[PDB]
């Protein structure tokens, strides 16, 4: 009984997708297939710095008058950038649907990058990075990406190195903007109280101008030892399947089974036919090795001794999860934008439920043995990590002598 | 006693060839120094089995294959080769008692060794003069091993007497003085 997500396509290739609902406020966003993976180490912070500059005024709406408009209807303006996708989204009322779309049009095209602003946003970005190091789990996940995807464009961070940040100019930005903002790589997603025909007419009216035009995991280890920190963050991952491979669903159930360290989180990060599947835990130094041992045992148990009850529990946790999420308008629009960018279509919740209920214990331990057993992991540690075991002990913990 | 030897060591951990505090760089033993010990065991077994299966009497004495005759004395009496250095020293000292004592000291001088360390650096990796003195010590230890074999006659005796004098003077006198000189060269003393 969930309403279907209807997708149309303009000549430009900008797929305009919408999923109407009763709620009177909507989350209209633009999703662009452009991240740090498309950068070539000479413009490693171009997407981040453009994400900073995108709200500082356009040609038609110069400066803060633009954001005065998004204050005037009381709407909320957000943007984010990952290694593969960039999103500019607005939460607003339903009756303010046209102007919001027009605002989004300016943000993607006709944007103005002021040289004055460029210096101010450089100091913002530089400073934030200079303090970003504070967030450990971000440092650990960046270290994990770097050591797992050495030599590839997937190792480099979204923010880029301070070097590039300082060394960036309007023209470079202009390039990234004019290169990675093509209309066939763009989705206009709407969720909530929107009509699809009105949104399609608004996309035809504005946004109809957008121009139309080997990933490798390396089993490795990075250890940033700094003994003055009170807690240690350790992430261990193996290679993921990618977006389009359905056993992701089964792997999600495996994560739902795992769900000793103060904080233990499992992740399945997916990129275009690659990814990182693993666990991040933050712990006191004198516990670290025991955690690792614990964690590896659970993975091998999922490779060898999965039972039906924990599989049923993981399926229930996954169902609830995906359905708990996909609740508010934003979460949904976000799903529409990512689904049109990655799968090329919006997968409905009934298909997700079918793919969940076809998962049993035998195929779960088969897929877990395919992806976890006897695999070389990527390890990233930060903090008092002397008792964190080196690569032979972790690699030996990636299998059992008793199977 | 070897179990006590291992205990008195783990309290302090093993040393490294640079002689520095290796606390910043330590690794496990199971996968790194176990396969290394297994490889060393294999090489030692290779040398032991090529000593047993190919040259089983190159280190022993032929006269041990005769039965023990109390009436017949051999023309030349030796212990087995690893006692030779001591044998030389014993023979060198004219006095019987002196020989016995020196002999004992030969082994005991080692125990005395931790009180003779006068350098601010633990290892000899960065100490070339004491390296030269150490290899001269290994050299005249080999000389004393050879002399023991040689019979009692000129000039084997004199070498034995000198070699023993040089052995005790290098261990007792020359190495701490050299360590003081090496500390003076680094502007430490
Ligand atoms: C030494 C004079 C300077 C030599 C300079 C050589 C060139 C150095 C610059 C070019 C680089 C060449 C290669 C360098 C390798 C490393 C540096 C080096 O080897 O230095 C020379 C070496 C150590 O020199 P160092 O400790 O700094 O001071 C010399 C004190 N004589 O010292 C030596 O190499 C010479 C050591 C000679 C030892 C002779 C021992 C003879 C006695 C043996 C007795 C054995 C027992 C005999 C019987 C006893 C009982 C009777
Ligand atoms: C009965 C024969 C012996 C056995 C089985 C034995 C056993 C061992 C073992 C297992 C170690 C640790 C591994 C190593 O560092 O090589 C060791 C180290 C050591 N042994 Fe022995 N040992 C023996 C004889 C001796 C003797 C005669 C001495 C004294 C001259 C000695 C002094 C040491 C020292 C000083 C170390 C520390 C090594 C270092 O940190 O540099 N051992 N021994």
XYZ file of C-alpha atoms and ligand atoms in Angstrom:
686
model
C 0.000 0.000 0.000
C 3.069 2.286 -0.060
C 2.723 4.720 -3.011
C 5.042 4.041 -5.921
C 7.893 6.365 -6.864
C 7.188 7.716 -10.345
C 10.158 8.685 -12.524
C 10.163 10.820 -15.668
C 13.028 12.053 -17.828
C 13.572 15.377 -19.521
C 15.519 15.774 -22.719
C 18.440 16.908 -20.614
C 18.544 13.525 -18.952
C 17.639 14.973 -15.573
C 15.369 12.317 -14.177
C 12.642 14.054 -12.217
C 11.428 11.621 -9.584
C 8.725 12.225 -7.006
C 6.773 10.282 -4.401
C 3.648 12.109 -3.293
C 2.221 11.771 0.205
C -0.255 13.542 2.482
C 2.307 15.444 4.528
C 2.060 19.103 3.589
C 5.783 19.821 3.729
C 8.179 18.453 1.136
C 11.842 17.655 0.681
C 12.890 18.625 -2.848
C 16.505 17.858 -3.664
C 18.991 17.564 -6.498
C 21.312 14.541 -6.533
C 24.445 14.688 -8.688
C 26.720 11.738 -9.501
C 29.842 13.694 -8.587
C 32.129 13.136 -5.619
C 35.766 12.752 -4.619
C 35.980 9.606 -6.770
C 35.681 11.743 -9.907
C 38.496 14.077 -8.818
C 42.008 13.613 -10.174
C 44.217 14.762 -7.212
C 44.665 18.234 -8.732
C 41.123 19.266 -7.698
C 40.703 17.056 -4.624
C 38.593 19.566 -2.704
C 36.580 21.037 -5.563
C 33.261 19.412 -4.658
C 33.548 20.350 -0.974
C 34.558 23.939 -1.716
C 31.783 24.285 -4.312
C 29.395 22.877 -1.683
C 30.525 25.754 0.533
C 30.193 28.333 -2.257
C 26.812 27.138 -3.565
C 24.732 29.057 -0.992
C 26.655 32.352 -1.114
C 24.746 33.885 -4.014
C 24.027 33.364 -7.706
C 23.907 35.622 -10.754
C 20.149 36.200 -10.519
C 20.083 36.316 -6.685
C 23.332 38.057 -5.657
C 24.557 37.231 -2.172
C 22.540 36.855 1.021
C 19.326 38.030 -0.687
C 19.223 34.450 -2.016
C 19.212 32.998 1.478
C 16.809 35.773 2.499
C 14.386 34.111 0.081
C 14.807 30.739 1.762
C 14.250 32.471 5.084
C 11.122 34.199 3.760
C 9.108 30.993 3.349
C 10.715 29.458 6.434
C 12.357 26.667 4.449
C 15.474 24.729 5.432
C 18.461 24.447 3.088
C 20.963 21.597 3.364
C 23.742 20.126 1.249
C 26.160 17.249 1.614
C 28.925 15.551 -0.339
C 30.173 11.965 -0.262
C 32.821 10.151 -2.276
C 30.291 9.437 -5.050
C 27.227 11.698 -4.675
C 26.434 15.351 -3.992
C 23.039 16.497 -2.724
C 21.370 19.912 -2.430
C 18.013 19.595 -0.673
C 15.322 21.932 0.674
C 12.634 21.132 3.232
C 9.674 23.445 2.709
C 5.895 23.618 2.639
C 3.871 22.184 -0.226
C 2.445 25.514 -1.445
C 5.979 26.924 -1.784
C 6.853 24.129 -4.245
C 7.575 26.309 -7.382
C 10.002 28.891 -5.934
C 11.974 26.176 -4.089
C 12.491 24.362 -7.407
C 13.559 27.665 -8.967
C 15.970 28.183 -6.058
C 17.427 24.717 -6.641
C 17.838 25.575 -10.326
C 20.040 28.546 -9.434
C 22.086 26.384 -7.063
C 22.912 23.932 -9.830
C 23.375 26.345 -12.698
C 23.817 30.097 -12.908
C 25.618 29.791 -9.601
C 28.103 32.554 -8.902
C 31.445 31.959 -7.252
C 32.706 35.223 -5.800
C 36.448 35.601 -5.509
C 35.904 37.419 -2.253
C 33.937 34.493 -0.989
C 36.538 32.055 -2.239
C 39.091 33.381 0.276
C 36.517 33.436 3.095
C 35.358 29.881 2.373
C 39.005 28.782 2.107
C 39.607 30.030 5.656
C 36.417 28.296 6.742
C 37.356 25.032 5.096
C 40.985 25.267 6.107
C 40.094 25.957 9.696
C 37.467 23.256 9.868
C 39.946 20.713 8.552
C 42.515 22.056 10.976
C 39.983 21.158 13.647
C 38.345 18.244 11.842
C 41.214 16.109 13.012
C 39.410 16.329 16.330
C 36.721 13.903 15.227
C 38.422 10.587 15.626
C 35.957 8.263 13.952
C 36.181 10.494 10.862
C 39.981 10.216 11.017
C 39.755 6.427 11.387
C 37.312 5.992 8.500
C 39.432 8.259 6.276
C 42.494 6.177 7.216
C 40.561 2.994 6.412
C 39.547 4.361 2.998
C 43.128 5.462 2.266
C 44.777 2.170 3.223
C 42.046 0.065 1.599
C 41.988 1.934 -1.712
C 45.687 2.970 -2.019
C 46.555 4.437 -5.407
C 42.923 4.874 -6.485
C 40.622 7.937 -6.458
C 38.658 6.233 -3.641
C 41.499 6.733 -1.129
C 41.326 10.520 -1.250
C 38.981 12.263 1.166
C 35.945 14.389 0.346
C 37.536 17.470 1.934
C 40.896 16.979 0.224
C 44.308 17.856 1.575
C 44.872 21.312 2.953
C 47.239 21.777 0.066
C 44.584 21.713 -2.593
C 42.201 23.703 -0.457
C 44.622 26.600 -0.394
C 45.511 26.093 -4.034
C 42.124 26.398 -5.716
C 40.708 28.984 -8.067
C 37.438 29.992 -9.623
C 38.350 28.488 -12.950
C 39.198 25.150 -11.427
C 35.918 25.193 -9.578
C 34.224 26.315 -12.728
C 35.609 23.233 -14.398
C 34.406 20.822 -11.753
C 31.111 22.601 -11.929
C 30.962 22.497 -15.708
C 32.322 18.979 -15.897
C 30.573 17.029 -13.185
C 27.208 18.816 -13.212
C 25.797 17.263 -16.378
C 22.051 16.864 -16.826
C 22.029 13.041 -17.478
C 23.873 12.592 -14.152
C 21.237 14.533 -12.195
C 18.068 13.543 -10.334
C 15.436 16.002 -9.126
C 13.814 14.071 -6.280
C 10.699 15.140 -4.396
C 9.049 13.514 -1.397
C 5.870 14.395 0.482
C 3.008 16.661 -0.493
C 3.995 17.153 -4.140
C 2.203 16.422 -7.396
C 4.367 14.715 -10.006
C 2.895 16.599 -12.970
C 3.427 19.997 -11.329
C 7.006 19.040 -10.420
C 7.615 17.836 -13.989
C 6.269 21.133 -15.363
C 8.510 23.078 -12.971
C 11.530 21.003 -14.018
C 10.652 21.698 -17.656
C 10.359 25.420 -16.872
C 13.586 25.709 -14.900
C 16.453 23.209 -14.797
C 15.747 22.388 -18.427
C 19.002 24.116 -19.266
C 21.490 21.863 -17.515
C 24.027 20.921 -20.157
C 24.083 17.459 -21.636
C 27.672 16.238 -21.725
C 39.707 0.024 -11.860
C 38.447 0.264 -8.299
C 40.677 -1.893 -6.108
C 40.703 -2.940 -2.462
C 44.149 -3.494 -0.985
C 44.424 -5.507 2.189
C 46.597 -3.183 4.225
C 47.016 -1.354 7.522
C 47.486 2.226 8.704
C 48.349 2.822 12.370
C 48.323 6.406 13.661
C 49.769 6.068 17.151
C 49.177 9.020 19.491
C 49.246 7.906 23.128
C 47.897 11.173 24.587
C 44.347 10.449 23.393
C 42.062 8.877 26.027
C 40.309 6.404 23.717
C 41.248 4.368 20.656
C 39.163 3.975 17.496
C 39.751 0.904 15.303
C 37.995 0.046 12.027
C 38.390 -3.315 10.257
C 36.780 -3.867 6.863
C 36.797 -6.199 3.867
C 35.771 -5.538 0.268
C 32.066 -4.994 -0.290
C 30.089 -6.135 -3.328
C 28.738 -2.811 -4.603
C 25.373 -1.183 -5.129
C 23.893 -3.502 -7.765
C 24.806 -6.846 -6.186
C 21.731 -8.214 -4.331
C 23.648 -10.146 -1.634
C 24.175 -6.735 0.017
C 20.721 -7.414 1.490
C 22.023 -10.673 2.963
C 25.120 -8.853 4.220
C 22.839 -6.280 5.847
C 21.122 -9.139 7.696
C 24.578 -10.266 8.826
C 25.236 -6.773 10.175
C 21.870 -6.958 11.934
C 23.111 -10.097 13.682
C 26.161 -8.259 15.016
C 24.448 -4.916 15.524
C 33.080 -5.495 24.633
C 34.145 -2.177 23.220
C 32.475 0.957 24.500
C 31.087 1.497 21.008
C 30.696 -1.137 18.320
C 29.205 -0.251 14.984
C 28.959 -2.286 11.812
C 28.989 -0.664 8.390
C 28.339 -1.678 4.787
C 29.517 1.310 2.744
C 28.770 0.796 -0.949
C 30.226 2.521 -3.996
C 29.982 1.707 -7.707
C 30.894 -2.010 -7.814
C 32.988 -1.747 -4.622
C 32.705 -1.012 -0.932
C 33.831 -1.477 2.645
C 32.094 -4.028 4.870
C 33.219 -4.149 8.467
C 33.211 -2.864 12.036
C 34.418 0.216 13.906
C 34.932 0.199 17.653
C 36.262 2.797 20.062
C 38.110 1.469 23.050
C 40.517 1.836 25.919
C 43.985 0.672 25.061
C 44.074 -2.284 27.483
C 40.964 -3.862 25.898
C 41.727 -3.469 22.165
C 43.133 -6.921 21.322
C 40.315 -8.683 23.204
C 37.763 -6.682 21.239
C 39.398 -7.660 17.974
C 39.407 -11.315 19.018
C 35.773 -11.068 20.021
C 34.790 -9.418 16.775
C 36.632 -11.850 14.529
C 35.019 -14.781 16.310
C 31.563 -13.419 15.545
C 32.433 -13.070 11.860
C 33.684 -16.636 11.708
C 30.573 -17.808 13.530
C 28.517 -16.134 10.817
C 30.662 -17.953 8.277
C 30.302 -21.337 9.933
C 27.527 -21.664 12.506
C 24.628 -19.406 11.548
C 21.295 -20.629 12.929
C 17.749 -19.795 11.879
C 16.801 -17.816 15.002
C 19.531 -15.182 14.665
C 18.796 -14.971 10.926
C 15.118 -14.311 11.731
C 16.164 -11.672 14.278
C 18.445 -10.010 11.724
C 15.669 -10.028 9.118
C 13.282 -8.371 11.589
C 15.936 -5.781 12.507
C 16.538 -5.045 8.811
C 12.866 -4.762 7.936
C 12.129 -2.466 10.809
C 15.211 -0.467 9.967
C 14.568 0.246 6.315
C 10.974 0.990 7.130
C 11.740 3.056 10.202
C 13.967 5.002 7.912
C 12.171 6.141 4.796
C 9.643 7.675 7.216
C 10.058 11.455 7.137
C 10.010 13.335 3.863
C 13.725 14.043 3.786
C 14.831 10.537 4.531
C 12.620 9.508 1.646
C 13.681 12.085 -0.930
C 17.227 11.165 -0.061
C 16.355 7.546 -0.897
C 14.778 8.605 -4.210
C 17.902 10.550 -5.197
C 20.298 7.749 -4.257
C 18.089 5.104 -5.897
C 17.927 6.971 -9.198
C 21.666 7.681 -9.097
C 22.831 4.173 -8.121
C 20.264 1.572 -9.213
C 18.735 3.719 -11.949
C 15.300 3.079 -10.421
C 13.507 3.370 -7.090
C 13.322 -0.078 -5.499
C 9.976 -0.340 -3.673
C 9.675 -1.646 -0.132
C 7.794 -4.754 -1.297
C 10.807 -5.816 -3.375
C 13.023 -5.176 -0.339
C 10.702 -7.349 1.764
C 10.834 -10.120 -0.858
C 14.643 -9.980 -0.948
C 14.684 -10.052 2.864
C 12.326 -13.030 3.179
C 14.243 -15.062 0.605
C 17.316 -14.863 2.883
C 17.840 -17.980 5.015
C 20.711 -19.212 7.186
C 22.439 -21.326 4.514
C 22.799 -18.546 1.956
C 23.783 -16.132 4.742
C 26.710 -18.291 5.812
C 27.545 -18.912 2.132
C 27.676 -15.175 1.343
C 29.537 -14.455 4.599
C 32.106 -17.129 3.714
C 32.351 -15.505 0.276
C 33.056 -12.047 1.719
C 34.596 -12.540 5.196
C 36.350 -15.908 5.369
C 40.099 -15.909 4.556
C 40.021 -12.330 3.255
C 42.703 -9.696 3.721
C 41.222 -6.798 5.727
C 42.003 -3.094 5.833
C 42.806 -1.876 9.354
C 42.822 1.754 10.509
C 43.709 2.630 14.099
C 44.011 5.970 15.874
C 44.910 6.541 19.508
C 46.741 4.341 22.032
C 46.907 1.425 19.624
C 50.057 -0.406 20.718
C 48.100 -3.462 21.907
C 46.171 -3.423 18.617
C 47.527 -6.580 16.935
C 49.530 -6.344 13.753
C 48.520 -7.727 10.396
C 49.508 -11.388 10.843
C 47.380 -11.819 13.965
C 44.331 -10.146 12.390
C 44.835 -12.111 9.156
C 45.092 -15.341 11.159
C 41.944 -14.331 13.028
C 40.211 -14.031 9.650
C 39.949 -17.859 9.569
C 39.593 -20.828 11.926
C 41.744 -23.963 12.021
C 38.621 -25.981 12.911
C 36.687 -24.299 10.063
C 67.874 -23.492 35.306
C 66.883 -22.637 31.727
C 63.319 -22.017 32.928
C 64.762 -19.638 35.557
C 66.902 -18.122 32.757
C 63.781 -17.440 30.660
C 61.958 -15.943 33.667
C 64.751 -13.581 34.647
C 64.635 -12.333 31.088
C 60.970 -11.764 30.383
C 60.960 -9.424 33.350
C 63.205 -7.272 31.178
C 62.593 -8.384 27.620
C 65.209 -9.186 25.003
C 67.840 -6.773 23.744
C 68.241 -5.506 20.198
C 71.439 -5.164 18.101
C 71.317 -1.357 18.222
C 71.320 -1.528 22.026
C 68.563 1.086 22.306
C 65.181 1.024 24.015
C 63.037 -0.941 21.557
C 59.730 -0.197 23.330
C 58.497 1.918 20.406
C 58.912 -0.986 17.933
C 57.862 -4.387 19.288
C 56.026 -7.126 17.459
C 54.401 -10.406 18.439
C 56.438 -13.569 18.579
C 54.068 -16.148 17.140
C 54.127 -15.178 13.530
C 57.370 -13.277 13.386
C 59.989 -14.946 15.561
C 58.432 -18.368 15.557
C 58.730 -19.075 11.877
C 62.226 -17.567 12.248
C 63.057 -20.040 15.027
C 61.577 -22.846 12.901
C 63.868 -21.848 10.010
C 66.854 -21.721 12.369
C 65.895 -25.152 13.741
C 65.773 -26.477 10.169
C 69.219 -25.047 9.334
C 70.702 -26.392 12.589
C 69.189 -29.803 11.807
C 70.752 -29.632 8.328
C 74.192 -28.994 9.840
C 73.660 -31.676 12.515
C 72.584 -34.341 10.014
C 75.403 -33.503 7.612
C 77.704 -33.857 10.623
C 76.163 -37.225 11.555
C 75.449 -38.832 8.171
C 78.521 -37.698 6.262
C 81.460 -36.940 8.597
C 80.620 -38.773 11.841
C 84.194 -38.699 13.191
C 85.634 -35.334 12.128
C 85.161 -33.876 15.627
C 85.854 -36.940 17.778
C 89.125 -38.642 18.551
C 90.096 -41.995 16.978
C 91.741 -43.240 20.202
C 88.319 -43.377 21.886
C 87.572 -46.424 19.696
C 90.108 -48.462 21.659
C 89.149 -50.013 25.018
C 90.359 -48.342 28.208
C 93.835 -49.640 29.052
C 95.143 -48.431 32.441
C 98.557 -49.880 31.570
C 98.854 -48.096 28.203
C 98.992 -44.337 28.126
C 98.277 -42.409 24.911
C 101.095 -40.304 23.432
C 98.961 -37.135 23.519
C 95.990 -36.481 25.817
C 93.192 -34.071 24.867
C 89.676 -33.275 25.974
C 87.069 -32.687 23.284
C 87.636 -29.417 21.120
C 85.305 -27.123 23.102
C 87.406 -27.641 26.246
C 90.590 -26.731 24.375
C 90.580 -23.000 25.093
C 90.574 -23.878 28.755
C 93.105 -26.610 28.219
C 95.484 -24.114 26.714
C 95.201 -21.778 29.641
C 95.778 -24.565 32.125
C 98.877 -25.725 30.314
C 100.115 -22.154 30.025
C 100.344 -21.384 33.736
C 103.440 -23.091 35.123
C 101.942 -23.667 38.573
C 99.399 -26.455 38.723
C 97.148 -24.535 41.049
C 97.581 -21.415 39.003
C 96.421 -23.301 35.968
C 93.344 -24.633 37.686
C 92.410 -21.192 38.944
C 93.029 -19.450 35.651
C 91.074 -22.166 33.972
C 88.142 -21.501 36.238
C 88.499 -17.770 35.789
C 88.477 -18.375 32.073
C 84.839 -19.300 32.401
C 84.168 -17.097 35.407
C 85.633 -13.971 33.833
C 82.339 -13.798 32.017
C 80.319 -13.574 35.201
C 82.636 -10.779 36.188
C 81.780 -9.084 32.854
C 78.678 -6.974 33.890
C 80.806 -5.044 36.420
C 83.350 -4.061 33.737
C 80.902 -2.133 31.519
C 82.066 1.500 31.619
C 80.303 2.798 28.497
C 77.142 4.863 28.150
C 76.080 2.749 25.142
C 74.843 -0.787 25.715
C 75.694 -2.417 22.375
C 78.795 -2.458 20.181
C 76.930 -1.440 17.011
C 78.135 2.165 17.406
C 81.474 1.392 19.103
C 84.232 0.582 16.580
C 87.314 0.441 18.853
C 85.647 -2.022 21.213
C 84.478 -3.914 18.104
C 88.139 -4.275 17.093
C 89.030 -5.440 20.611
C 86.119 -7.920 20.542
C 87.254 -9.463 17.270
C 90.821 -9.670 18.599
C 89.310 -11.530 21.582
C 87.514 -13.960 19.241
C 90.794 -14.299 17.314
C 92.919 -15.324 20.277
C 90.121 -17.570 21.561
C 90.508 -19.419 18.248
C 94.287 -19.323 18.784
C 93.904 -20.892 22.252
C 91.646 -23.554 20.725
C 94.411 -24.350 18.228
C 97.223 -24.343 20.785
C 95.461 -26.805 23.034
C 95.626 -29.203 20.140
C 99.311 -28.646 19.527
C 101.721 -30.704 21.639
C 104.077 -29.385 24.296
C 107.026 -27.918 22.424
C 108.314 -24.639 21.024
C 106.808 -22.350 20.039
C 103.311 -23.542 20.798
C 103.971 -22.889 24.466
C 104.869 -19.227 24.127
C 101.834 -18.507 22.009
C 99.763 -20.196 24.655
C 101.296 -18.059 27.343
C 100.818 -14.861 25.403
C 97.382 -15.778 24.107
C 96.263 -16.317 27.719
C 97.857 -13.025 28.818
C 96.190 -11.208 25.910
C 92.819 -12.870 26.646
C 92.776 -11.784 30.287
C 94.157 -8.316 29.487
C 91.580 -7.631 26.752
C 88.650 -8.709 28.921
C 89.913 -7.122 32.148
C 91.784 -3.976 31.079
C 91.463 -3.032 27.415
C 87.671 -2.960 26.909
C 86.753 -0.579 29.818
C 89.617 1.769 28.885
C 88.441 1.664 25.266
C 84.871 2.392 26.387
C 86.126 5.412 28.345
C 88.003 6.607 25.226
C 84.887 6.098 23.061
C 82.815 8.104 25.550
C 85.480 10.826 25.368
C 85.234 10.905 21.557
C 81.483 11.597 21.623
C 81.954 14.494 24.119
C 80.193 12.466 26.827
C 82.992 11.846 29.344
C 92.381 2.292 11.828
C 93.120 3.392 11.101
C 92.181 4.165 10.184
C 91.580 3.256 9.120
C 90.711 4.068 8.170
C 90.134 3.200 7.060
C 89.339 4.057 6.086
C 88.103 4.639 6.760
C 87.369 5.599 5.830
C 86.939 4.938 4.521
C 85.907 3.837 4.741
C 86.553 2.457 4.743
C 85.604 1.424 5.334
C 85.071 1.937 6.664
C 84.386 0.831 7.453
C 83.900 1.372 8.791
C 84.902 2.343 9.408
C 86.172 1.643 9.835
O 86.362 0.464 9.593
O 87.192 2.387 10.552
C 88.497 1.842 10.722
C 88.463 0.783 11.819
C 87.758 1.363 13.038
O 88.288 2.659 13.306
P 87.987 3.402 14.700
O 87.475 2.378 15.683
O 87.179 4.646 14.416
O 89.453 3.845 15.184
C 90.597 3.102 14.773
C 91.405 2.726 16.007
N 92.637 1.996 15.610
O 89.796 0.404 12.159
C 90.356 -0.553 11.217
O 89.744 -0.806 10.197
C 91.686 -1.214 11.476
C 91.556 -2.254 12.581
C 92.857 -3.037 12.713
C 92.758 -4.155 13.744
C 94.042 -4.975 13.743
C 94.073 -6.009 14.863
C 95.430 -6.702 14.873
C 95.638 -7.565 16.112
C 94.815 -8.846 16.060
C 95.246 -9.791 17.173
C 94.505 -11.121 17.102
C 95.064 -12.090 18.136
C 96.566 -12.246 17.934
C 97.171 -13.206 18.949
C 96.897 -12.747 20.374
C 97.482 -13.738 21.371
C 98.980 -13.861 21.210
C 71.645 -24.040 28.530
C 71.761 -23.331 27.413
C 71.001 -22.080 27.243
C 69.700 -21.967 26.869
C 68.737 -23.084 26.558
C 69.400 -20.590 26.828
C 68.127 -20.165 26.455
C 67.902 -18.859 26.111
C 66.762 -18.365 25.454
C 65.587 -19.184 24.984
C 66.924 -17.029 25.313
C 65.932 -16.098 24.659
C 66.122 -16.049 23.137
C 67.412 -15.372 22.760
O 67.579 -14.202 23.015
O 68.380 -16.060 22.139
C 68.164 -16.672 25.886
C 68.653 -15.386 25.943
C 69.785 -15.028 26.675
N 70.656 -15.846 27.264
Fe 70.540 -17.847 27.256
N 70.475 -19.859 27.165
C 71.494 -20.698 27.426
C 72.801 -20.399 27.795
C 73.168 -19.116 28.157
C 74.395 -18.760 28.704
C 75.512 -19.729 28.980
C 74.368 -17.392 28.922
C 75.435 -16.569 29.515
C 76.571 -16.320 28.874
C 73.100 -16.922 28.488
C 72.712 -15.604 28.561
C 71.610 -15.135 27.853
C 71.345 -13.719 27.641
C 72.190 -12.588 28.159
C 70.216 -13.639 26.910
C 69.550 -12.364 26.455
C 69.704 -12.150 24.954
C 69.572 -10.697 24.613
O 68.483 -10.016 24.996
O 70.450 -10.153 23.989
N 72.387 -18.004 28.018
N 68.746 -17.821 26.375
